Amino acid sequence: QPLSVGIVGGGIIGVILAAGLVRRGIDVKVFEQARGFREIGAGMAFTANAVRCMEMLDPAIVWALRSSGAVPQAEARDYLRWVDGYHESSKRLYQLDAGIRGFEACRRDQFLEALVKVLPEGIVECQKRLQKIHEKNETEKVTLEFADGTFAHVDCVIGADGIRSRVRQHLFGEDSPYSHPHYSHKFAFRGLITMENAISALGEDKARTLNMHVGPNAHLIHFPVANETMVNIAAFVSDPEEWPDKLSLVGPATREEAMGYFANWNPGLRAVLGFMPENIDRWAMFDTYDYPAPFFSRGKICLVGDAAHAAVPHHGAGACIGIEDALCATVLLAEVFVSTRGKSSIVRNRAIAAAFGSFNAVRRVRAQWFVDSSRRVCDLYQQPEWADPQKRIKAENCFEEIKDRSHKIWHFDYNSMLQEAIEKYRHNMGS
Template identity: 45%
Template sequence: MSKKESHSTSHEEQFEIAIVGGGICGLILAIGLLKRNVKITIYEQSQSFREIGAGVAFTANAIQCMRLIHPGIVDALKTVATSNGNPDDPNDYLQFADGFNQKEDEESKIIFKLYAGYRGFEGCHRAHLLDELVKLVPDNVVRFCKRLDHYVDPGDEGKLKLYFEDGSTAEADAVIGCDGIKSKVRRILLGEENPASYPTYSHKSAFRALIPMDRAASALGDELARNQRMHLGPSAHLLHFPVAHQSLLNVVAFLDDSTERSYSSRLSEPGSKQEVVQAFASWGPTVRTITNLLDDEMDKWFIFDTNDHPAPKYASGRVCIAGDAAHAASPHHGAGAGIGVEDALALSRLLELVTESMEKGGRASKQEALTAAFAAFDAVRRERTQWFVGSSRMICNVYELNNAETGNDMDKIYEEIKWRSHKIWHFDIDGMLRQVEDQYKGKLDGDNIPKSML
């Protein structure tokens, strides 16, 4: 990690934000706030920054959000990102194939594809991206081994107090929970007895693996191995795309799982190649070839999300939640991290507006300004992000020919995937920024802040 000094301002109304959680969303938010001279401290429960899972991808729209947060984030992504196909002439399409009905003597055929924009699908390994983002965060703003137990809001102009499981405490003017799908901040904010405080099981499991590209290309051919492909079929689907500068093929196989699991269950466990091979035994030869490339032992992930019990609010007073802590989605749109980046941009702009309000010496107190900022975030971000959670569940059924509206009609499947993907990819970033500014300024009137936010 770099030894840069953290940004700060000497203004007497300076405020400090506690970011709980140091994953990709928390780090990107931290980088955005530091750039805007907002004082922050990151509280991470692990001994070091780490990311679980393997591949992650970002669309052109998400990358533009990164650029607006801090251009260095885009530079970090480009250092580790891998585009489809030839890096000098990237394939800017997401491609969908019928993985089930392929005959033995046929090549895997694309049934339709979607243009995602120039370099509109940048894949990378989560841990590699995290390593690059860490370089943009000063050492002196991070506290490791800090697992939040609870926080206390004094309800006046005083600071919030955070209590950690190791017995230590900290203070901050506001708290942002970026602590993921099992968010402790969400549980405190919504209440331990609220079903929305906990993720629920989607009854889908995902087997994740990384295959050396030379092995993949030898078995599948360069064109297929080095380009993203979604293989559709009955009650399962399989996705792959290149990562690590085309040196690895990231493979994810999605299967039904009828078992009941609670939020306190482990999110993953060791899985076996045999389980995947057996599940796809009746599929076409391309998918069977991919499953035979898998290692004997691999990770099996259980997919939880917040679809069944959406959070009724993302903020209360000077506490809010963002990213997976607010709206964890199943991964079937491949855009959950990008939606979290949108959150980080919205919060970066809102807290920049708070700084501007304090510097102008407006009538609102620091507490009122921070409360208004988080209320504006809730007002602007909740509808889109909760639509995304529901759409991520629904699109899985489309991929697996289980949706009543689309069935196995490939024309209908294409149209459903197209409009939902475009709603995610063609998001009006400038419009969101105007909305958060308008909402913030309106809520500074006081009467416009819902009582539930105070």
């Protein structure tokens, strides 16, 4: 008889996890609270390291990804560039070469769409908002209770339900701050301008490439989208106030509100905000930084993705971390499957618990480092000393650490992680 996994959350991580597990013969169910709506129309990007992890999960995942972007005489290397956004000199500060297809970009909604088609029919169950978890003995199934009154029974439970995970609250208690994200005291304006507008304000070289503009207490990212016809703007600013608890995290705002935060910045950069639509959006940045999980797993329950370790997005790699989680969880559960197949139910459930323990041992340090790292690079992008031209040497000193932190993300040794995870699983089984 087989092994069943209930994944709470039908986001990118939970769906990628499902693909990896089913392709190995594991019985999977994905329970998604939402009706069946895709993600936001925004773009996202994956490191070549995450794409290779996708491949190892199921090569159809990478096909889904590449059929969900656009079509790019020699081959283009991907570059991150930083520019001085506060002085009209707007000189280029720093550049990181990511190599050929160092990043591969897609539409979130289009990728999640292609992924669900890759899955066999009957994996994803929508309007299934989890509300309680009923654990029993290790040897017994776990019961998930949903808001619509239905129930489901699975051998083990993975929380892939995002920044406001319900599986997390069950683990730590609804009133513990560890069950919840908190504000990072920054929020973002987001919106589009046309390429001719972008060209007009920044010049063609800056307009056609991804560039981050540093300055004091704020920073702004822009990159072309929709085959170099549009440019996406993301403008992050500092907010000393608390975010009202049940106030939504996304909200409406005006280009004039954004322009005010940047009034002292150089002309081209203010023009870019001036070219946005009159109405734009305001995104509050919450994460798990103040109260990181003490453990990603307990018994036969495991957290993954933003549920385990949601981050502010200043590395553009938070889902990459989640894809590592999926690859690790998938390889471990596969090893449970093959190594206990002819054994009693006692051994099979012990092995699940040993696998989830191993997952926590090998993943928590890197993921929680990454959450911290994401806040740290924002602080470097927003040094007060960017304002002071006499403090330029200090301000620009930051880029070596940004380099180190990027390379630690991009050059992750996932083969060693998998090897370590298997060894810890066998050790945990008394082997």
